Amino acid sequence: SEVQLVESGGGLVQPGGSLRLSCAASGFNVSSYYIHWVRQAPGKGLEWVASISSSSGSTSYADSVKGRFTISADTSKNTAYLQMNSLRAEDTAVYYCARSGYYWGPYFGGFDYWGQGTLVTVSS
Amino acid sequence: IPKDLEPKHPTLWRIIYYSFGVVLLATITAAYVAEFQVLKHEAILFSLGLYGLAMLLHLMMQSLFAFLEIRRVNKSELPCSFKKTVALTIAGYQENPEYLIKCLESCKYVKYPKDKLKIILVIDGNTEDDAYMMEMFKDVFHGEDVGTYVWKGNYHTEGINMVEELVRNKRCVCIMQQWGGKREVMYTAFQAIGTSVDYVQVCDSDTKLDELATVEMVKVLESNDMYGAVGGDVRILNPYDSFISFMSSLRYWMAFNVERACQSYFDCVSCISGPLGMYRNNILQVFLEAWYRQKFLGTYCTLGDDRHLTNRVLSMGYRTKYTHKSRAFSETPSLYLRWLNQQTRWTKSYFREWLYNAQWWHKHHIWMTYESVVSFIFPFFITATVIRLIYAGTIWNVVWLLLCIQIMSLFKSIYACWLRGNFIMLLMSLYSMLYMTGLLPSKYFALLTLNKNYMPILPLSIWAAVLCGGVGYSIYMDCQNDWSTPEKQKEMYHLLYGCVGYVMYWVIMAVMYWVWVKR
Amino acid sequence: IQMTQSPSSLSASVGDRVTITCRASQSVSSAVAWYQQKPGKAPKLLIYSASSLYSGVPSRFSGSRSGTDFTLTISSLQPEDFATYYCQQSSSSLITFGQGTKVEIK
Ligand SMILES: CC(=O)N[C@@H]1[C@@H](O[C@@H]2O[C@H](C(=O)O)[C@@H](O[C@@H]3O[C@H](CO)[C@@H](O)[C@H](O[C@@H]4O[C@H](C(=O)O)[C@@H](O[C@@H]5O[C@H](CO)[C@@H](O)[C@H](O[C@@H]6O[C@H](C(=O)O)[C@@H](O[C@@H]7O[C@H](CO)[C@@H](O)[C@H](O[C@@H]8O[C@H](C(=O)O)[C@@H](O[C@@H]9O[C@H](CO)[C@@H](O)[C@H](O)[C@H]9NC(C)=O)[C@H](O)[C@H]8O)[C@H]7NC(C)=O)[C@H](O)[C@H]6O)[C@H]5NC(C)=O)[C@H](O)[C@H]4O)[C@H]3NC(C)=O)[C@H](O)[C@H]2O)[C@H](O)[C@@H](CO)O[C@H]1O
């Protein structure tokens, strides 16, 4: 079993609405790794959105993300979820899914086994 | 970052502490020699001397301090903010495939966040016959961050970079290295840990861990920044293997919940147990190299690496604690000459580390040096009194010696029974016959061969021969006498009552042992 | 916290050793990782812990740190090595990515 990450729930949405992206993992358990959501605006650099640690409940968001977006992880389906409400026109990007280990100190391990990209378009 | 934390006037405190120790030893010897009677009556052939009063006061103060520390630990509660990283370090040589699995499952199922706990296991002897432990380690932690390495070498024989990156980056790590001993695997794990964790917990390959041990130790370590190390209660997996195992379990409870509690009352715990122990990572990284390269006056040490770890922690002015809310279960020898070998090894390590520990008495409480002096000088006075009363040429003398020893043991057992709230501790009085027969000669055997299997039989033989000759001489010399005198008649009216009480006590203790164990 | 990549656009031939500098004002207890991404593809991890090499990455890539600065060096620039390289200062509760540094050809 090779590690794979698939994305679902991306598409077009009017500003002010809501969306629920889903990250389905295969080959590993989300309870033993971190799950991060990374987005890339059209023609721009990478941006970190949120992070979730299963079996511990540790969630982290960004200053432009906190308050609006929520991140969760279901171990009965072995997936992660990102619910974005109060969407703005600036949130259109290509959302990725990354796997990583844990933070011990000056050593992290990296963002190995990136998922694919799912497209979100917030426009009228 | 941490420093030696020396006192403001290191020389003055050193001088006054050494003077206090010398004065205490001289006073104890003078009280023993003087034989000044305090409380006396007639029709009683025993009194209470100054030496006896001093010993009773020491026992009372130790019991009171242990009770106070236990009550204080029970009452207080701590937050445990859960923001500290812990590294569980296990070392293995040839662990049974039945105990290692229990240890690994207990480590896996402990109650602490998985993103704050990192497990490392180091195996001696990468000779293709020890891969059955790495395979079981992989099986236990199949669905986690697992890094396994077989290092064809050692830190004191590339591999170093791979070992360090695997230990510092992954969560569950299994490293097999060339055989160097228990010190080698512990040093390798400590060095490969680096600055990746805040606290380092040490375990053995046989210990079964309670689910709350790690969280309780982290809780007690987080409360005060002065604490550098902490231990926990250690239980016995097999207290019914033999008579020796049961006595060993009772002695373990006594030494952990009375002596160690009293030591922790003043934050001067002398030894942190092997199976259970937490250390601050920065101090450990500071003193690791010095700890590894330590010889006893020109001889390498392969004993008491936990006692030496506690000594290194104490040498930097950092205090060590003990908490009874963290528990673990270990295995003890159930056969003679093996428990005897273990006791001889422990005595050797204690005697070797006493001189090193004597250097840093000024940095801690005066109770530390007081207890060190009294515990060092007690067995010699025990032997001297035993010899004098044995060869005094009177049967009542040896009978009263036995009665006094059993009375002291009974007092200790009664206090332990009250403190624990459970009645099996009355059998702790049975450790007198084990201490008076093997442990006392083993102490002298360890002392005479400090620099270094059927070998400790000879001290037992010498002690038994001396005791038998003394009892025979006393019986002969009291057989040749006239008991018609009214002094030997009061001696007789003491002998009969003492013998009746002694036999009754032995009978009831044996019956209680059989009733408690058989059921 | 701000993470700045020194060369925003870089051009080199085949076989040229190229270096990329990256400055971050928060270097207390955060690891620095280097990733590579090609057009229309997800980024892949090159270097983690600012010095270690990910399994499968060619040994030409290397990472180093000098105080605040973090450097990624390619000793020989192969035709497959033209992509966009990113920094990452990743700790708990905050992760920051670099930007730019698109390696091109003459
Ligand atoms: C003529 C004239 O002048 N007068 C006439 C009268 O004559 C008079 O008659 C009277 C009379 O007899 O009545 C007479 O009075 C008597 O006089 C005598 C002197 O002659 C006087 O002695 C009498 O007083 C009594 O004397 C007793 C005595 O001799 O001492 C005394 O008993 C002692 O009391 C002590 C006080 O508390 C008590 O402590 C003693 O018991 C021992 O104490 C030891 C100790 O404390 O150190 C114990 O040792 C320790 O035990 C603990 C227990 O758990 C162990 O744990 C420990 O071992 C350690 O354990 C660690 C552990 O964790 O387990 C180990 O750690 C391990 O470390 C390794 C690495 O190193 C790691 O790898 C391991 O993991 C780790 N272990 C674990 C687990 O993790 C560690 O290594 C290990 O060391 C152990 N050792 C140590 C060093 O700590 C010990 O167990 C214990 O037994 C006790 N002694 C006993 C019981 O034998 C009495 O208290 C005292 O009262 C006096 N009598 C009276 C009543 O006063 C007159 O002299 C005489 O003149 C005449 O009668 C009349 C007639 O009319 O006439 C007159 O004229």
- In chain A the domains, ranked by start, together with CATH numbers, are 4-122 (2.60.40.10)
Q: B304 C-alpha to center of ligand 1: Å?
A: 24
Q: What backbone phi and psi angles, to 5 degrees, belong to B353?
A: -85, -10
Q: Is C91 on the interface with B (CB under 8 A)?
A: no
B380 shares a domain with B313: no
Same domain, residue pair B16 and B165? no
B103 and B63 within one domain: no
Classify residue B352: in a domain, yes or no: no
Q: Would you call B380 helix, strand, or coil by DSSP?
A: helix
Q: Are residues B325 and B248 in the same domain?
A: yes
d(CA B483, CA B481): 6
Tell me, using a 6 A CB cutoff, whether residue B342 lines ligand 1: no
Mark whether B65 and B91 lie in a shared domain: no
Does the residue B356 lie in any domain? no
Enumerate residues 6+ apart whose C-beta is below 8 A from A113. Answer: A3, A4, A5, A98, A99
**Chain B touched by A29 (CB under 8 Å):** yes
Which DSSP string do the residues of B95-163 spell out, in sequence order?
Answer: --TTHHHHHHHHHHT-SS-TTTEEEEEEES--SSSSHHHHHHHHHHTTTS-EEEEE-SS-TT--HHHHH
> B323 with B394, same domain?
no
B355 in a structural domain? no
All chains having 3 or more CB pairs closer than 8 angstroms to chain A: B, C
B46 with B149, same domain: the answer is no
User: Considering its fold, how many domains does chain B have in total?
Assistant: 2
Residue nearest to atom 54 of ligand 1 (CA): B255
Q: Which domains, and CATH codes, for chain C?
A: 4-106 (2.60.40.10)
Are residues B143 and B90 part of one domain? Answer: yes
Q: Is B171 exposed, middle or buried (0-12, 13-18, 19+ CB in 10 A)?
A: buried
Instruction: Report how far residue A53's alpha carbon sits from residue A29's, in angstroms, rounded to the nearest whole number.
Output: 11
**Residue B4 placed within a domain:** no
Instruction: Please count the residues of chain B.
Output: 519
CB proximity list for B34: less than 8 A, separation 6 or greater = B50
Residues in chain A: 124
Cβ–Cβ < 8 Å for B218, B84: yes
Q: Do B86 and B65 share a structural domain?
A: no
> Residue B66: which domain range?
10-73+368-518
Question: In terms of domains, do B65 and B184 share one?
Answer: no
Q: Which residues in C lie closer than 8 A to residue B169 (C-beta atoms)? A: 48-49, 52
CA of B492 to the centre of ligand 1 (A): 27
CA distance from start to end of chain C: 34
Query: Residues B178, B204: one domain?
Result: yes
Picking from B286, B317, B332, the residue at the C-terminal end of a domain is B332
Atom of ligand 1 nearest to the CA of B408: 97
In a domain, B342, yes or no: no
Determine the Cα–Cα distance for residues C95 and C92; give it in Å rounded to an integer.
7
Please, which residues bridge with residue A94 across strands? A40, A119
* Contact status, residue B130 vs residue B122, Cβ threshold 8 Å: no
Distance CA B208, CA B230 (A): 18
Asked if the structure places residue B187 within a domain, the reply is yes
The H or E element spanning position B249 is helix B243-254
Neighbours of B454 (CB within 10 A): 7
Q: Please report, for the domain that includes residue B323, its CATH number.
A: 3.90.550.10
Answer whether residue B253 is part of any domain: yes
Q: Mark whether B381 and B290 lie in a shared domain.
A: no
Determine how many CB atoms are found less than 10 A away from the CB of residue B346. Answer: 17
Q: How many CB atoms lie within 10 A of CB B462?
A: 13
- Structure letter (DSSP) for residue B317: T
CA-closest residue to ligand 1 atom 91:
B435
Whether B314 is in a domain gets the answer: yes
A98 touches C42 (CB < 8 A): no
Chains contacting chain C through 3 or more C-beta pairs under 8 A: A, B
Going by alpha carbons, the residue nearest to atom 113 of ligand 1 is: B46
